[PDB]
Ligand binder design. Structure first.
Ligand SMILES: O=C(O)c1c(C[C@H]2c3ccccc3C[C@H]2O)ccc2c1OCO2
Ligand SMILES: O=C(O)c1c(C[C@H]2c3ccccc3C[C@H]2O)ccc2c1OCO2
Ligand SMILES: [Cl-]
Ligand SMILES: [Cl-]
Lengths: 148, 148
């Protein structure tokens, strides 16, 4: 459970926002990319796994699940790649709500930033600090408890 | 303190590697950029502060300390910007050693990656997972203890 992440891809301003959600906490990392390729997804996962103890990733679609570049990155970083099929059917809706929430925050800050990527990182900041404990506090506690 | 980070800028292959070190743990995040500008530094700090509770940043040089863009980002993200003057000189040597260590790891992986940025993220991974507890474990424990 402390090592489980979910990939999520959403669209805005003709660009792609790639999101990784730490399932147990709601903590996110996100990046803007031109389009979702295996290459971009692989690089994003490498970055993520160097920063947090990523054990399992539920991939966002079959193309990234199949991608040999994504598979190579998961092998390199010690990540178990799984499908992201919501067998638990509250998963679809929960991701959906987050995408809407994220886009809402992006809209609230969009004017403060010249570039979309900046607005997205502002949204990541606001999302992870929002007291609901915050997601940032929850992920740290979950992983610390797991280490001890 | 759990919230103290140090900026560090090093060069490789005609490019710039921007590093943020969590001082108490040795945990790092890093990115490759064309050159160290206020703009790049500001964006990097925004990303960092959305991911970890950054209270204080010791800037790597006077240009980033002075930069109005860096100051704007620090204001936005609630970061206290300080100088990075090694009033204790066992600080300057510790950064030196890390840059050398990082470049060594980069050399050990460079061949596995087409692009420098990939090799840098591999080096971040290896550095943060290396048991000596790992840096990744230490940062999580320090911040968890601080929350609770
Ligand atoms: O080759 C690259 O640098 C490169 C790769 C592949 C590499 C890679 C990436 C992650 C982990 C191991 C390895 C090994 C290796 O397969 C993928 C995506 C990228 C890349 O550059 C930017 O986006
Ligand atoms: O405007 C941008 O998007 C932009 C900025 C400035 C913005 C910014 C950046 C961080 C925090 C607050 C604010 C407010 C605002 O000043 C800086 C660097 C960048 C940017 O784009 C990529 O690198
Ligand atoms: Cl946070
Ligand atoms: Cl780690």
């Amino acid at each position: 459970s402390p090592g489980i992440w979910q990939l999520d891809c959403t669209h805005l301003e003709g660009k792609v926002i790639l999101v990784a959600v730490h399932v147990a906490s709601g903590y996110i990392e996100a990046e803007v990319i031109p389009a979702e390729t295996g290459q971009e997804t692989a690089y994003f996962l490498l970055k993520l796994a160097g920063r947090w103890p990523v054990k399992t990733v539920h991939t966002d679609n079959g193309s990234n699940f199949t991608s040999t570049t994504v598979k190579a990155a998961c092998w390199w970083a010690g990540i178990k790649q799984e499908d992201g099929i919501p067998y638990n059917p509250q998963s679809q809706g929960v991701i959906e709500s987050m995408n809407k929430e994220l886009k809402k925050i992006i809209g609230q800050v969009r004017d403060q930033a010249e570039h979309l990527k900046t607005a997205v990182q502002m949204a990541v900041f606001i999302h992870n600090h929002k007291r609901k404990y915050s997601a940032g506090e929850r992920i740290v506690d979950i992983i610390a408890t797991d280490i001890q």
